[PDB]
Write a protein that binds this ligand. Structure first.
Ligand SMILES: *[C@@H](O)[C@H](C[C@@H]1CCNC1=O)NC(=O)[C@H](CC(C)C)NC(=O)O[C@H]1CC[C@H](c2ccccc2)CC1
Ligand SMILES: *[C@@H](O)[C@H](C[C@@H]1CCNC1=O)NC(=O)[C@H](CC(C)C)NC(=O)O[C@H]1CC[C@H](c2ccccc2)CC1
Lengths: 299, 299
C-alpha cells in the first residue's frame, strides 16, 4: 500500500511556459486558452504589495511570451479572473483532454504535476487540508503547476500553485483563480490557522492496514460516535459523522470490522501512541488517503 | 519534500493488454515488439511448478491476443528470453519513446507505472532494496507493469513486475527477463533474506531534512568511517564507503555539514531513537531517496 498518483500523461500535454518581462512560470493550455497565476506580471519589487489591476494595464498581448516546447504561441487576448490570468492564443491545444474545472472539498486528494519552465519534473499525491493548505514540494518557478484527478478519460483540474507559507506548506487557487483558504497572492507571511486531522481518512488507512495483514492495533472494545468525538476534539481530529460512517461502509464490509470498533482502536492509538510499532510502514497516523483512494488501491 | 515519481506519459503510450487463454496481463510495446512476463502462458493449475519450455511449445502466434486500446495487434512471431516473452507484432508502436533497457543496482530508485488490463492506474516511486525486492502496490493483473527512470527525453526501463513474496514485498525482472535476486517465477513461497538499510540514502534524506529547515537531530559530535560502520553493522545498515562520502559531497557542500558529522547524528538517532519527534513528516528513518533524488528535488 503506497501513496499513488494518477498517470500524468493527459496533463503533461497541457503544460506550457509563460514569460512576462523576466518573470517565467508555467501555464495550462486547454483549447485556445492558457491559464496561469497572475503574478507572472510582477517584478521582484512588485510582489510585496502588488496592485494587479494597475500592473496589468501596462501590459499588452505581445508582452506575454507563451512557449510550448520549441514553438511560440501568439497571444491574441488577455484578461484577469480573480488570481489567474487567461491568455487567449491563436491555436487550440491538439492535446487537450476531456476536462473540467472543479473546486475540491477539504479532506479530498489529488495529484500534483510539478513543472518548471513548462516542463514536467515529477508527480505526487496531495490532500487539501482542513485549513486549505497542501504539503507539497515546490521550488521557485513551480507556480502554475496544477493538481488534478482523473475519472475514466476525464481530467478534473482542481488546483493551481501560487505560493508558500511560513510553515513550509503551500497555497493556491482553483482554475477560476479563487484561492483555497484565506490567502492572497502577495509576498507576506500569512497564517493558515490550526490544522486538524482528517479523521475519516485515518480510519480508511487503518482499514487499508487491516486489508494488508497489519492488525496489531485492533482491540476488544467499541465506542460511540459521541464518545469518540470527545476524544477527537482533544486531539484536533475532525468530528466523525454518520455520512463518514456510511462512506466507510464498503471498507467495513470488506474487513468485517464495524466502524465504531475501528474508532475504538483509533482512540487507543491516540491515547497510547504506537509504542514503537508501525502501520503500513509508518510510525505516524496517515490522513491523506480517502476511503475512495483505499478502495481504488485495494481492488 | 515528497516521494515523487517521474511523469508517466512517455510510458503510458507503451502499455498494452496481453491475453493467452484466460490469463490476461500487461505488456510493454516498443517498436514492433511486445514484452511481457512469460507466465501469461500459464493456467491456474500451471503456476505451482510450470515447465515453461513445455508449455510454450503448445502455443502459436495466434494464441496471443494483444490489444492496444480498442485495436488488436497481429502477433507474427514469439520467443522466450529468460522469464520474459517477446511477441513480434506487425505494427511498430508510433508512441515509442527514446528508450533503453538497464539493469539497476540495489539502492537505486525508479518509478512504477502500475497497470491493469493494459490501462495505467497509478504511478509511484520505489527503490530496489539490497535484497533485490521492492515494496510496491500490486494486485492480481498487475504483472507486466514496468519501472523506469527518465533522463531528459530518454526512458530507461529497469523493472517488469512478476510476483509477490510472503513478506508482502515484490519481485521481478529486468527487461531481458533476468530476475533481480534469487527468485524464480513459480507460485511457491520464496525467501528474500535479511534486508538491510541503504545508509547512503538515509544520509541523503537527513541532508534534505536540513535543507528543509528540520535540524533538531544535529549534534556536536563527529565520528570516523570505521567507527560509524561498527554501529551500522549492528543495525543492519549497509557499510558506508568513501565513494558514498563523495556522492554525498554536493549535499554536504550545500548544507555546510561534513559527512562524518551527519554520520555522528545518525549514530545518535540509531542508538537513541527519535523520542517521538519527526523528520520531514516521518517518525522513521527514510532510505528510498538517493543523493541524486534529493539534489533533483531540492533544485
Ligand atoms: C511561484 O511563483 C512561487 C512558489 C513558491 C516559491 C517558493 N516555494 C513556493 O511554493 N510563488 C511565490 O514566489 C509567491 C509569489 C506571490 C504569490 C506574489 N511568493 C511567496 O510564496 O512568498 C513566500 C516567501 C517565503 C515567505 C516566508 C517563509 C518563511 C518564513 C517567513 C516568510 C512566505 C511567502
Ligand atoms: C501477476 O501475475 C501477479 C502479481 C501478484 C499477484 C498478487 N500481488 C502480486 O504482486 N503475479 C503472480 O500471481 C505470480 C505468478 C507466478 C510468477 C507464476 N504468483 C505469485 O506471486 O504467487 C504468490 C502468491 C502468495 C504467496 C504467499 C503469500 C503469503 C504467504 C505465503 C505465500 C507467494 C507467491
Amino acid at each position: 500500500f503506497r501513496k499513488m498518483a494518477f498517470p500524468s500523461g493527459k496533463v503533461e500535454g497541457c503544460m506550457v511556459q509563460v514569460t512576462c518581462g523576466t518573470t517565467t512560470l508555467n501555464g495550462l493550455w486547454l483549447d485556445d486558452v492558457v491559464y496561469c497565476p497572475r503574478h507572472v506580471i510582477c517584478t521582484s519589487e512588485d510582489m510585496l504589495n502588488p496592485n494587479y489591476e494597475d500592473l496589468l494595464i501596462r501590459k499588452s498581448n505581445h508582452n506575454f511570451l507563451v512557449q510550448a516546447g520549441n514553438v511560440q504561441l501568439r497571444v491574441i487576448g488577455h484578461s484577469m479572473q480573480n488570481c489567474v490570468l487567461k491568455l487567449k492564443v491563436d491555436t487550440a491545444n491538439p492535446k487537450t483532454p476531456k476536462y473540467k474545472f472543479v473546486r475540491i472539498q477539504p479532506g479530498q486528494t489529488f495529484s500534483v504535476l510539478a513543472c518548471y519552465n513548462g516542463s514536467p519534473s515529477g508527480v505526487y499525491q496531495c490532500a487539501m487540508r482542513p485549513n486549505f493548505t497542501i504539503k507539497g514540494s515546490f521550488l521557485n518557478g513551480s507556480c502554475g503547476s496544477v493538481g488534478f484527478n482523473i475519472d475514466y478519460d476525464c481530467v478534473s483540474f482542481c488546483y493551481m500553485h501560487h505560493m508558500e507559507l511560513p510553515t513550509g506548506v503551500h497555497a493556491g487557487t482553483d482554475l477560476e483563480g479563487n484561492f483555497y483558504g484565506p490567502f492572497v497572492d502577495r509576498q507576506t507571511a500569512q497564517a493558515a490557522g490550526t490544522d486538524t486531522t482528517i479523521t475519516v481518512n485515518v480510519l480508511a488507512w487503518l482499514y487499508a492496514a487491516v486489508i494488508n495483514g497489519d492488525r496489531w492495533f485492533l482491540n476488544r472494545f467499541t465506542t460511540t460516535l459521541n464518545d469518540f468525538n470527545l476524544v477527537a476534539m482533544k486531539y484536533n481530529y475532525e468530528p466523525l459523522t454518520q455520512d463518514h460512517v456510511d462512506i466507510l461502509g464498503p471498507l467495513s464490509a470488506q474487513t468485517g470490522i464495524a466502524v465504531l470498533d475501528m474508532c475504538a482502536s483509533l482512540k487507543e492509538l491516540l491515547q497510547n501512541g504506537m509504542n514503537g510499532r508501525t502501520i503500513l510502514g509508518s510510525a505516524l497516523l496517515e490522513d491523506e488517503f480517502t476511503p475512495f483512494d483505499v478502495v481504488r488501491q485495494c481492488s
